[PDB]
């Protein structure tokens with residue numbers, strides 16, 4: 286039996302669906318229990334990782350967990366997981382934990398605050414550490430639905446966006462096959478691309494030329510603060526500024542783990558084309 290925390294999430298839902306396809310018993314952790322929408326064959330359980338007293342019920346009879354990073358409550362998770370007899374935890378982390386002075390980066394900190402307790406817990410683990418999620422591009426959907434111009438703080442900043450389906454495939458491999466215990470996988474997509482190039486590729490999926498223009502940092506900050514705490518917005522903008530005009534590393538880790546090349550961002554855009562069509 287596997288508990289998939291965040292079974293409604295972009296990554297978690299695909300982990301859960303893939304495990305059900307394999308005939309495995311899947312419990313799906315949710316903060317909102319009543320709403321429909323979980324993948325078929327997933328047993329819903331209401332829990333909140335910030336309320337680890339909720340976790341005893343969710344973990345009963347569970348051998349393995351797919352864990353989203355929620356630092357408030359990690360010590361409680363570890364205690365409940367140990368008490369329940371969980372053998373393996375696959376954590377969705379971040380490549381930021383691998384960067385120099387990661388302790389001084391809000392994003393690196395948050396993810397290290399979960400990795401370190403798991404490493405000390407005595408539980409088996411696998412860490413999955415993606416770079417930029419291709420789904421970050423969904424933030425442009427209102428603009429792309431509405432016309433052929435998108436605003437970016439750093440049109441020329443490079444990332445190496447990774448398809449959520451690849452992340453889910455790596456997680457499922459770690460949950461279901463040998464050789465992943467104490468592994469930490471830094472995942473990228475197959476190509477480093479600028480923000481403007483990503484916008485253009487979404488346009489290519491739509492049959493339309495979609496352009497990108499710069500916006501001031503203060504404007505970008507206001508937009509990002511709709512999604513994230515100020516500390517995180519500052520880290521994102523600093524990271525983009527550092528990648529302006531500087532191609533990022535492409536790693537072959539997805540293929541190393543799964544045997545399949547990483548899915549392209551262009552394929553991602555085709556997969557999500559409905560989000561961008563008006």
Ligand SMILES: NC(=O)c1ccc[n+]([C@@H]2O[C@H](COP(=O)([O-])OP(=O)(O)OC[C@H]3O[C@@H](n4cnc5c(N)ncnc54)[C@H](OP(=O)(O)O)[C@@H]3O)[C@@H](O)[C@H]2O)c1
Pocket residue numbers: 290291292293294295296297314315316317332333334335353354355377378379380414415416417418420421
């Ligand atoms: N954005 C990036 O470029 C980037 C880069 C590297 C790593 N990451 C990592 O990827 C994560 C995003 O994954 P995603 O795209 O799948 O996100 P998502 O679709 O927003 O899903 C996030 C999931 O987290 C669950 N969750 C959050 N707080 C929780 C809590 N207190 N208790 C239980 N579950 C909780 C939510 O559960 P409910 O749906 O039940 O509320 C939700 O299903 C980030 O948070 C970060 O750790 C992101």
